[PDB]
Write a protein that binds this ligand. Structure first.
Ligand SMILES: Nc1ncnc2c1ncn2[C@@H]1O[C@H](CSCC[C@H](N)C(=O)O)[C@@H](O)[C@H]1O
Ligand SMILES: Nc1ncnc2c1ncn2[C@@H]1O[C@H](CSCC[C@H](N)C(=O)O)[C@@H](O)[C@H]1O
Ligand SMILES: COc1cc2c(cc1O)[C@@H]1Cc3ccc(OC)c(O)c3CN1CC2
Ligand SMILES: COc1cc2c(cc1O)[C@@H]1Cc3ccc(OC)c(O)c3CN1CC2
Lengths: 357, 343
């Protein structure tokens, strides 16, 4: 009935915004620091927040966020015999205990290097992205509209050159997610072993090629991106930075990488970029495409959602952006002069697709 | 645990509500329903009924990319261009053929930019004593903002009013307590839709709708309803019986007791005030009664100082502090209650 569906439909905006607040308050890392199978109250978690130390009501407000995440199965919820038993019939215990789940373990920065899914999820729920989603209907109603352009007056990469906060949130979301994806690549794919040089075309701040050279130290690494990205990139061992425009000229390189680049652009733009890569490669060279591939038949699984999530984001964020099937990627490479397409499944829809010159 | 499994579970959370808002603004669910409520239809068939899309060759392919995410999330059925059909959830997004009622107006209010911009400041309520996320985002409190922002005033007022109609249809199936009333004052009654529906069912009730000037001045004329403007914290008009629906949950304990004492002073011996709210259950889980309370609990935490959902015991404590001497809680549906306070 209506008053069943109010719950199913009304929770949809609330859950992601409660999740974002919990990430910004460092809830998941604070729970982790109590140990392996920890179950801790809102007051114990708030005790570890110096910013809350003069707010008597902090824990009761925090509990209101955490109990929604518990109902949604993002946190586990429990109590103790002492809480049920010690106060007597006239005392009410309002505070339950919260623990991590398989999903919230992926929101804890790792002890060794700080990696997790936090930075990418803070980008996809950033106000710059949500404001673009508020204009999503314009793609259906208006020929050649782009929601990001309706919201902001500029396209995304040009906007990043003028807005240093957005530039940082985007660049860090790509870089930390990159580390997670390359750990999965290196478990399955052996095509880097024989290389002597790798050029990362649209390589962001250089994190991806930094990880490739760390694993394969005989590779000379080159990172190529727009001026406003290269100006903020760190110095990485074994990585040379190059600034420019991939649609005008790609540097010469023995092999090339395009990760999370083709999915932002329409077919003509993709073929133009791939022809620029072909001209700058030697005979025998290859370019590697790394993307979440759209399955031939969609269903209820991680591989399907891993493509549908960025398909909706790129529809909002850039003209022509979309996720593609194996056959659609093959068609782009073939149109640009490449041969011997080799699609390599990695994990949950993530592929390496090799294009040979 | 695998990072590249959990990317799917966590990354869809922001995407689903924003796809749902676009589909409601494009009237997708009503367009499917006009082929027949059991119909299965393609993105191109749906787009052919949107005059705004008629010079956009690419409209159906973009529409399909929105609808296939909703089909993967149980809001639409998908079958083999794929064909889309309604579900139990999306039938509640079709304006009724009889009167245009659905959940659309309330769902467009709780995902409105004014509300989402408040949720961007939600962490401030934990860190900073006495902060309110809406105030941090907008520079004024919500009812003051509505007085200077006509678009927001309309979205809020219409969300409350259309939701009110489906709530009172549930109330009238279970609760008989309006019979033999001769007069009812709706305190904080919005644009008056609630008291209009009570007088339609109980034609001997003289209905009075009471709210702030910026709400009353935009309210429609309803048969059997008189509108009065004022400030409920300063004084409430005399009335034989009163209603407080979705009012107490916006305010802290001291403000609630002040308002309830104003109501007590303006009631006769033998009068009652009715509280209508979604009541917080004693145990929370993955079920409609739990989420019906947790959704507005999170919204009012963001939107107004002191606002929160309450248990039956906590409502009783407020009525007793204001002088009321008999509390009768009446379950209606999925956590919604009528709670009578007797003078
Ligand atoms: N014309 C252009 N020339 C070079 N880089 C460009 C470009 N237009 C966009 N880009 C870059 O394309 C990248 C897309 S995001 C992906 C970054 C990285 N390859 C990763 O997988 O993490 C951004 O860093 C962006 O600045
Ligand atoms: N000081 C005050 N005096 C009277 N109305 C007030 C008020 N402060 C807030 N309100 C009103 O309280 C209402 C809360 S929203 C609920 C409206 C209606 N009772 C329903 O259930 O649909 C709004 O219409 C708002 O304008
Ligand atoms: C499965 O969940 C996700 C998967 C992916 C992304 C975000 C998710 O949450 C991001 C989103 C995104 C947005 C804009 C981009 O360029 C403008 C961009 O390259 C990417 C990369 N993709 C990689 C795939
Ligand atoms: C179960 O889903 C929902 C339940 C409820 C609301 C919205 C939902 O989506 C709205 C949200 C809301 C926000 C602000 C208010 O005053 C400032 C207000 O009275 C209400 C009313 N409540 C009624 C209960």
């Amino acid at each position: 009935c209506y008053l069943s569906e109010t719950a199913n439909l009304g929770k949809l905006i609330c859950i992601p915004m409660a999740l974002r607040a919990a990430m910004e308050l460092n809830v998941f890392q604070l729970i982790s620091k109590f140990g392996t199978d920890a179950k801790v109250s809102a007051s114990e978690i708030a005790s570890k927040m110096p910013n809350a130390k003069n707010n008597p009501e902090a824990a009761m407000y925090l509990d209101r966020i955490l109990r929604l995440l518990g109902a949604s199965s993002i946190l586990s919820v429990s109590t103790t015999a002492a809480s049920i038993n010690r106060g007597g019939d006239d005392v009410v215990v309002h505070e339950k205990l919260y623990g991590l789940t398989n999903s919230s373990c992926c929101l804890v920065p790792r002890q060794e290097d700080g990696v997790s899914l936090v930075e990418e999820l803070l980008f996809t729920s950033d106000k710059v992205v949500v404001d673009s989603f508020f204009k999503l209907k314009c793609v259906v109603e208006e020929k050649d509209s782009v929601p990001f352009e309706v919201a902001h007056g500029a396209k995304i990469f040009e906007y990043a050159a003028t807005e240093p906060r957005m530039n940082q949130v985007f660049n860090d979301g790509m870089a930390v997610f990159s580390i997670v994806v390359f750990e999965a690549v290196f478990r399955v794919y052996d095509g880097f072993l024989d290389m002597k040089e790798l050029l990362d075309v649209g390589g962001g701040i250089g994190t991806s090629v930094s990880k490739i050279v760390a694993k394969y130290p005989l590779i000379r690494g080159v990172n190529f991106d727009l001026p406003h990205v290269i100006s903020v990139a760190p110095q990485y061992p074994g990585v040379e930075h190059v600034a420019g425009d991939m649609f005008e000229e790609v540097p010469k390189g023995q092999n090339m990488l395009l990760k999370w680049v083709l999915h932002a652009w329409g077919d003509e733009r993709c073929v133009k970029l791939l022809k620029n890569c072909w001209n700058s490669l030697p005979v025998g060279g290859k370019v590697l495409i790394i993307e979440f591939v759209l399955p031939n038949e969609l269903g209820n699984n991680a591989e399907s959602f891993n493509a549908l999530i960025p398909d909706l984001l790129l529809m909002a964020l850039n003209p022509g952006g979309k996720e593609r099937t194996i056959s659609e990627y093959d068609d782009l490479g073939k149109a640009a002069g490449f041969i011997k397409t080799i699609p390599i499944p990695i994990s949950n829809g993530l592929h390496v697709i090799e294009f040979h010159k």
